[PDB]
Amino acid sequence: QSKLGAVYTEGGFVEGVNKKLGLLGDSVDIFKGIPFAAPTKALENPQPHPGWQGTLKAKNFKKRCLQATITQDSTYGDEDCLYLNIWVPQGRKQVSRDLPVMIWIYGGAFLMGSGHGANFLNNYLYDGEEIATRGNVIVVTFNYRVGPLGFLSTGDANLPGNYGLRDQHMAIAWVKRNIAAFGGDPDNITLFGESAGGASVSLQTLSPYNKGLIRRAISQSGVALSPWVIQKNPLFWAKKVAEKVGCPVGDAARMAQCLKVTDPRALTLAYKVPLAGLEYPMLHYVGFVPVIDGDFIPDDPINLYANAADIDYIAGTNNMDGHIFASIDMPAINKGNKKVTEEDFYKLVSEFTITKGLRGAKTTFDVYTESWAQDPSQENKKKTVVDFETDVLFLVPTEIALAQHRANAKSAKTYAYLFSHPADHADDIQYVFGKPFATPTGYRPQDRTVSKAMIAYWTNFAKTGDPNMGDSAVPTHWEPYTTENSGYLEITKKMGSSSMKRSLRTNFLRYWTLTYLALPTVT
Ligand SMILES: [Zn+2]
Ligand SMILES: [Zn+2]
Ligand SMILES: [Zn+2]
Ligand SMILES: [Zn+2]
Ligand SMILES: [Zn+2]
Ligand SMILES: [Zn+2]
Ligand SMILES: [Zn+2]
Ligand SMILES: [Zn+2]
Ligand SMILES: [Zn+2]
Ligand SMILES: [Zn+2]
Ligand SMILES: [Zn+2]
């Protein structure tokens, strides 16, 4: 009477595990490996999963979708991968009902990842237990297809792409139809995700496929407007794969059907992004990502924000999000005894501004190195390289998305954040998921303070659309974003009234959205 037991879903009964928590009667019901769609076919849209007889034992994580290992030498996962996982918190007197529902979408550059995440200190990163029990919400995680098997496309109807986005949508629709049986409120679904997952969250809110399914959304370090998200030239990348696996490249239809019957492991390993050295910035080699298909993504995402008019929305970034691509594009920023020079940075800037030619390279170099005259230290120069990559890859897209969502808002609220700290220790995911509480030996008291506050804001928002209002106290009043106030919450170790800030790097946002765009395109 205080836990779920066998749950009747549309496919049949499902049995999970009840984990007792604390000493006074709380617990958590955990379901792992519930199928939400059929075994996948290579480069075909997902399909309903047939029902089952008896009681499905949802006791273990299932296989991730077929993908390259990080050494890009081999593969793991399986074509039968579309499974989801659920954490339902339980109090000590009665079974939970009408709980808010948060669906996590993992990142991994659309190339790798799974619903459980990396394992460290005997804990999966996306283990939803700490969010669910501390915020009194239901947490869902799930697998979607990645890499060529998730995103290969010819840019036309022969191979329209976006298979992995359709997988995500199928998981969302399943939760909407079924989660009330677990104690969830299906009218109150919040998506959240990071990096490619944050851009996926954003894409899901913009797609007409999700009309009436999504109540709220959180984009962490990634939005549909980031430059690494939409592949403008998919036929080029599909031809690359066709040549390495021996398919003809003359006719799009013939090539498409050849790829569909190619060993999916050969498809997955067809292309390896070089590690070093590269002729172009890292951004150039993001290949198999979403496309504008005129269907799931009917138009350029910038034109789609009417679809999110009643979806409350949080979006934010990490202060040094770009350090990942910056280290690859300029390895000197990590080597303490190697210099970054004006010539190195010009070269990097010029590669990002090719469409505006020499003038575009100069105006950008000039604005980012303005501070170098008074502070020529390597510390200031290397920080500048990171800030540049953060701005173009994360911050500027995110600010444009916030502005677009606010301008199209009807009932929707809009919120902005900057996460500042001090895998790497600076990253948001581990604090959002409560890792400092689940594996506390690896973390210090200040880490639990930050994670406690992030889970409070996130789960208050899931409950009410107001990060300040819900089951948890918060340290700083988080003011909704408007064009006039342009406010963001700076999330740090010690928060108070001055944590609510405004006008994040506005001179740089204005440069990219006004000055740079006013330059003539060269050819
Ligand atoms: Zn199955
Ligand atoms: Zn696994
Ligand atoms: Zn198999
Ligand atoms: Zn009810
Ligand atoms: Zn649908
Ligand atoms: Zn390029
Ligand atoms: Zn170039
Ligand atoms: Zn992150
Ligand atoms: Zn990071
Ligand atoms: Zn820390
Ligand atoms: Zn207020």
From Swiss-Prot:
Major location (coarse): secreted
Post-translational modification: N- and O-glycosylated.
Subunit structure: Interacts with CLC.
Sugar-bearing residue positions: 188
Regulation: Activated by bile salts such as sodium taurocholate.
Keyword annotations from UniProtKB, A to Z: Diabetes mellitus, Disulfide bond, Glycoprotein, Hydrolase, Lipid degradation, Lipid metabolism, Repeat, Secreted, Serine esterase, Signal
Subcellular location: Secreted
Function: Catalyzes the hydrolysis of a wide range of substrates including cholesteryl esters, phospholipids, lysophospholipids, di- and tri-acylglycerols, and fatty acid esters of hydroxy fatty acids (FAHFAs). Preferentially hydrolyzes FAHFAs with the ester bond further away from the carboxylate. Unsaturated FAHFAs are hydrolyzed more quickly than saturated FAHFAs. Has an essential role in the complete digestion of dietary lipids and their intestinal absorption, along with the absorption of fat-soluble vitamins.
Active-site residues from the entry: 195, 321, 425
Name of the gene this protein is made from: CEL
MF terms (GO), sorted A to Z: acetylesterase activity; catalytic activity; heparin binding; hydrolase activity; retinyl-palmitate esterase activity; sterol ester esterase activity; triacylglycerol lipase activity
Cysteine disulfide partners in this protein: 65-81, 247-258
Full protein name: Bile salt-activated lipase
Family: Belongs to the type-B carboxylesterase/lipase family.
Outcome, altering residue 425 to Q: Abolishes lipase activity. Decreases Vmax for esterase activity by 2.5-fold
Free-text tissue specificity from the UniProt record: Mammary gland and pancreas. Detected in pancreatic and duodenal juice (at protein level). Expressed by eosinophils.
The keyword Disulfide bond is assigned to this record: yes
Keyword field contains Signal: yes
Stretch of the intact protein here: 22 to 553 of 753
